[PDB]
Amino acid sequence: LAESNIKVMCRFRPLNESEVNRGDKYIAKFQGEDTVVIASKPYAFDRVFQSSTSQEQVYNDAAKKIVKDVLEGYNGTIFAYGQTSSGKVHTMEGKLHDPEGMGIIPRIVQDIFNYIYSMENLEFHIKVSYFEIYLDKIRDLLDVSKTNLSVHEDKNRVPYVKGATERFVSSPDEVMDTIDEGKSNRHVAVEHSSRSHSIFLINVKQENTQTEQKLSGKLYLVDLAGSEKVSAEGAVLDEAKNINKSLSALGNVISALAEGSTYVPYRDSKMTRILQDSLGGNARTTIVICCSPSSYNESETKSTLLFGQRAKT
C-alpha cells in the first residue's frame, strides 16, 4: 500500500529535584495536546507528552498499535531520538518489571508474549537480531567477531543483513537478556554517549495448524545516537561526522515519505536500506523524540525538536 503513516511524538521529562536546585527555569510552554513552545517558538507534532504522562500511556500512543500490526503480519519501526539526560532510556527501557515504570520495549515484549500465551493450534517463532551502525559499518552486537556485515536483497527484493546473528526466544526474560548482552557491546564514549545507531529486530512468525496459513512480521527498534556539533580530534571526529550524516540520510527518507514524495531515497544509507520494508508504505512508524524541559539544555532540545519536525507532513 502507500499510506505514509509516520507519527512523531515528543516526551518531556520532569526537571527532577537536583536540577531545580542548581538553578533552572522550565522554559517549555504547551498549547494543544500536541504543540510545545520553547523560546516563544511553537513546535507541532502528532502528540506531545508532558511530565505527568505515564509510561503506559506513551506505550499506548506510540507503540501499542504497531505491535498489534506486527502480530497481524505487518512490519513496523520505532525510533528513539534524544540528547543525553533527555529521558530516553527511561522512556525506552525504564525500570523493567515494575509494571508501572517499565518503558516502551519491555511492554512490547510482554504484549507479544501475552498474545502468544493467549492462543493450541498456533505455532510461534520469535527471532531477535541486534546490531549497530558504527562508522558506516554494520557490527553484530551478539557476535562481536562480526564487525563488518553487508546489506543485500533477496529474490523478492526485501533487504537482509548477511551473517547477522539470529537468536530464537521463548520467554520475555529471554528477550531482555539478549538485549542486555548487546548493550554491553554497543559503542559508547566520553557522559555515556552512543557513538553508533543500534537496531533491534523482533521477528514474529506464526503458523495456524488448521488453516495452515502462515504470518511473519518484523518489528525494528532503532536507537538513534544524538547528533553532534563536532569541530580525540581524529577517531572521535570520525564518529561524529557519521552520526550526523546517517541521521541526515534518515531525515531525508522520513521527510520524503511525510511529504508524499514518489521517490523515497532509501538506497542512500545502509540503515534506511535495511529498514526499507519497515519504513513507510503499508508499514507503521513512530519516532519518539525525548527532550529536556531544563534551561541548561535549551540549545539542543531545540535541535531535537527541529529533527522531530522533519517528520511532520
Residue numbers in the entry: 4 to 122, 124 to 194, 199 to 239, 243 to 324
Task: List sentences quoted exactly from the publication behind this structure.
We also found that when T92 is mutated to a valine, the nucleotide content of this mutant was very low compared with that of wild-type kinesin. Together with the observation that the T92V fluorescence does not increase upon incubation with mant-ADP, these data indicate that T92V has lost most of the kinesin affinity for ADP. Using these T87A crystals as seeds, we were also able to crystallize wild-type apo-kinesin-1 and the T92V mutant and to determine their structures. Whereas most of the following analysis was performed taking the apo-T87A structure as a reference, identical conclusions could be reached from these wild-type apo-kinesin and T92V isomorphous structures. Taken together, these observations suggest that the P-loop destabilization in nucleotide-free T87A, as well as in the isomorphous structure of wild-type apo-kinesin and of T92V, is the combined result of ADP release and of the loss of the T87-E236 interactions.
